[PDB]
RNA sequence: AAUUGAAGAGUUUGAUCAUGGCUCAGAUUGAACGCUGGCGGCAGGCCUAACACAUGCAAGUCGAACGGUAACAGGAAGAAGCUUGCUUCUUUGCUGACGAGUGGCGGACGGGUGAGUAAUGUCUGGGAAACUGCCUGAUGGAGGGGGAUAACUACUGGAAAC
RNA sequence: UAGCUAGUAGGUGGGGUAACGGCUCACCUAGGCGACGAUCCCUAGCUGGUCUGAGAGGAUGACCAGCCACACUGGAACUGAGACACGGUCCAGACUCCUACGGGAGGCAGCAGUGGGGAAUAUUGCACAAUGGGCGCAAGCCUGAUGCAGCCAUGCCGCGUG
RNA sequence: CCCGCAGAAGAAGCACCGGCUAACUCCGUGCCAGCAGCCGCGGUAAUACGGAGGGUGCAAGCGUUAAUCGGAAUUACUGGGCGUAAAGCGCACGCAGGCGGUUUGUUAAGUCAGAUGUGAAAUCCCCGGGCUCAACCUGGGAACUGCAUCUGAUACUGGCAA
RNA sequence: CGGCCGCAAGGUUAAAACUCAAAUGAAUUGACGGGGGCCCGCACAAGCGGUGGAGCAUGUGGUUUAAUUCGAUGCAACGCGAAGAACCUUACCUGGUCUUGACAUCCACGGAAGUUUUCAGAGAUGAGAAUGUGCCUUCGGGAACCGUGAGACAGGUGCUGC
RNA sequence: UAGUCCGGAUUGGAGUCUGCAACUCGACUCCAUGAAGUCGGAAUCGCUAGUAAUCGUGGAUCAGAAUGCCACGGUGAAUACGUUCCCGGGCCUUGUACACACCGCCCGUCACACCAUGGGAGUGGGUUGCAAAAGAAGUAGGUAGCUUAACCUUCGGGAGGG
RNA sequence: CGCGGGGUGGAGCAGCCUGGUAGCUCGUCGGGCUCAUAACCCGAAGAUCGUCGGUUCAAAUCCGGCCCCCGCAACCA
RNA sequence: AAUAUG
């Protein structure tokens, strides 16, 4: 959840800004406000979100000295609107931050293995024929046999016999190992794919 | 005419006596909170942030110190309107007065506070090398002259204070 | 907290103050203080008293009264009998307000009262009728000193609820 | 402050009840819930919890909590201990400090006696007086255990002499 | 922790937060000691014959089952309560049945009690057909006994031998 | 001298008896079958004289139902040198941190839960010594210039001030 | 196992080329001891010697195949 | 000889 201390100059505000704060709130965040005031913004108004964890906002009133104390002591961001559209819009903002899903991944390169080796003591090595993209390093895989998902993983080894090399792109023999593991025989598929986030703003 | 007074218990051990701590019965406050609350007398009432402050009020007063009319309260003189005996309205510091001002005395008292101060402080007992308006007792002078300046007028810099 | 002191300790002369004085200067001498606790640090307004205690003692300094210190922070002087001045002044600093933004104004640790602190402490009252001050020959004016009321079972004491 | 009118009319709560400590049974819960100042109660007959009845204390207050002293001879001067319970330095020599045999003279510092000045007033205390009495207010006395100076005493201690 | 001292290991000097409601000395009674003395018992020693192996009896645990009734569990339970489970005993199990009742006291009412017999049902049992009319009392009746109905009640080898 | 003319388990067939009843679940007989077992591990029990041991008999219980229990008799022993030792018990004395009594109590690591606290490179504030910079305002000292009512004057200016 | 050391009971070992009997520690399951428990003591369970053949009175450790694990060379980009 | 814990 996410808290809000919040003290205006008028009982109006309060009662105005507390109408729009429960429209923002939801299971993905809650956001509550807790203890709000009227009137100029204090020391016990500022301890109250450093006990809570809690925003400090206020309409067209500002902080006193004994306030900007425990602001300067103890951290908590100071923020004033004397225009209330942008103060329900800001209360988002700070919940949307909050949030942060994952949603999509895409294929960089696909590649087939051929012509296995097989050592005794440290399993399979690969060689390999990238059919389409282009097989990289440093990012997540895929190995597959008849369309379902053996093993994934990070690339440790791109590299045709000695030849160790970051890249290698379609139509071009490859050889491949992954981190933790050499169960690659022939006829299984890698899959490299690069990742997309989202990081949706909250509704 | 007189200065009168001192209580203990529980609790270590199976039980005892010591040593010995802890706790309670007492009186009290510049008190708070809980529950309950009819009236009266008398006394007390921000101990915390010497933290910050709206608005009103908390030191002025003398015309028997002096120019003066800024008043307004009359009188007197005078001019008018006529009602010829009256109101009306200009002059006049003449006056009962009195804003602003000059000057006198008070503003150092009365009131608030406990921040700083372990000794320039405070308290108690002494001292000399001193002053002391206002208040008193004692003895004498209180003669004769001059130049300014605020107020006020004539202007002017300034948003406002000035 | 065991060593601390150069105007430090003493003398002469000059200057200074109402007056004594390293008070402040020039020169000369090398002392001063120190375990009967110097110096340094922490903490603290002090006393007549209050509270407790059989007394000795202990704790404590609200109210009342005496005295000192402080007056947004820091420093200085003027006027005056007396101030290095709570509601006087000048400058710097912090901070609040005003403004034509150039530059100015303000100091409730006075009485009421508000924000804030905090467990918690009051009415933006009435009158100079009385006592006592300030001014004045006096009337008189001024006096949130003081006298009074309002508010709270806060305390003491009296009375009732037959 | 006094008189008059009406009618028991308008006006009692709070804590505690196992021992300490004045004041007892039943029911509910069953080592749970909870009480608890201290030692402790409650695990199926709870005088200790929760409720009810009865009882005890105190009164427009009652109780809890915080704060101070008392009890506490538990920092012990008055008024405690140190063989084994906390407590005699491992032992010795020694400066500063404390204390000192016995005789006479002298001094009068300490000490003891008297007097004067001072020990603010309020307070405290006693005897009185005035508010319906009391609280409260107030007359007078005593008190203010102290200190300084002067005049005396010379046993004891100190100084000084033999 | 800080100072001082020491080459260093360390010594000397010396707290507070916090936690417990006890810590501790001597002494008394008892128990305990792989502490000591003395002393007794099929305790050992000296012997005889057995158990523990085998088969069978009876009992217990465990196991299993619709039920394997309940209790007894170191010596001080385990051929035990049980001086004797084919039904009964018998409590436990599956069925079939009754609810003032199988069994006692009590009230009211009718019918002597009773000896005979049959069908249906596993039996408990219901439903019949038979037969009899007894001691006292004026038979007004009852005392014996059976059947019906009411509610006070009856019942439990259900639980708690802490 | 052997699994036997030793031992009787187990099983088949046919009977008897008590009783409503003899299947799971009786006793007993008759014929037939003839397991294991040839003196039993560590360990352990009883018994000191008409006893141990060994062979029979009777009863209670009871319709039928002992190898149990209770009771009776026949035959009938071994060995006790001794209290070193084991076990159990009594008395005296000693030690004790034990007292629901050694089947008592209780120590620390490590793990755990709970609780408080020290050091701390440093970072960010207040206070403050020393060395430099800084120098408002005010006072004190020195002053060319600018400016100047009182006093002095030869009337040009001086004295003196700002 | 390309070459090395091994294949024994549940685990770890001994039996060795010196071919006539597979036993010993810890475990497993029971019994005893103790007031009880651990400890201790007494017992019982548990094997084609991987798998086969050469072997030979009989392969028992002796041999070689099949086979398995590990040793390293290596089927070790 | 050696003997632990509740």
Redesign the pocket.
Same mark, same amino acid.
Do not use: M
């Given at each position: 959840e996410v808290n809000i201390v919040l003290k205006a100059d008028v009982q109006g505000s309060v009662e105005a800004i507390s109408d729009s704060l429960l429209k923002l709130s939801t299971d993905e965040v809650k956001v509550k406000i807790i203890g709000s005031?009227v009137?100029?913004i204090?020391?016990?108004?500022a301890?109250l979100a450093a006990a809570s964890n809690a925003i400090l906002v206020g309409f067209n009133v500002r902080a006193?000295? $004994?306030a900007r104390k425990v602001i300067?002591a103890e951290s908590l961001d100071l923020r004033y609107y004397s225009v209330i559209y942008n103060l329900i819009d800001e209360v988002k903002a700070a919940m949307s931050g909050m949030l942060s899903p994952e949603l999509k991944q895409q294929i960089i390169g696909l590649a087939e293995v051929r012509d296995?080796? *097989? $050592?005794? *003591? /440290?399993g399979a090595?690969? !060689?390999?024929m990238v059919t389409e993209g282009v097989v990289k390093r440093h990012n997540p895989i895929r190995v597959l046999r008849d369309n379902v998902v053996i093993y994934e993983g990070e690339l440790? $080894?791109? +590299? +045709? /016999? *000695?030849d160790?090399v970051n890249e290698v792109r379609n139509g071009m023999e490859? !050889?491949?190992?992954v981190k933790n593991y050499n169960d690659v025989r022939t006829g299984d598929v890698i899959e490299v794919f690069e990742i997309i986030e989202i990081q949706r703003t909250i509704a």
């Open positions: 005031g009137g100029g204090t020391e016990t108004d301890t006193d000295a $004994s300067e296995v080796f *097989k $050592s005794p *003591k /440290f090595i690969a !060689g390999c440790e $080894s791109l +590299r +045709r /016999f *000695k160790d490859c !050889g491949i190992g």
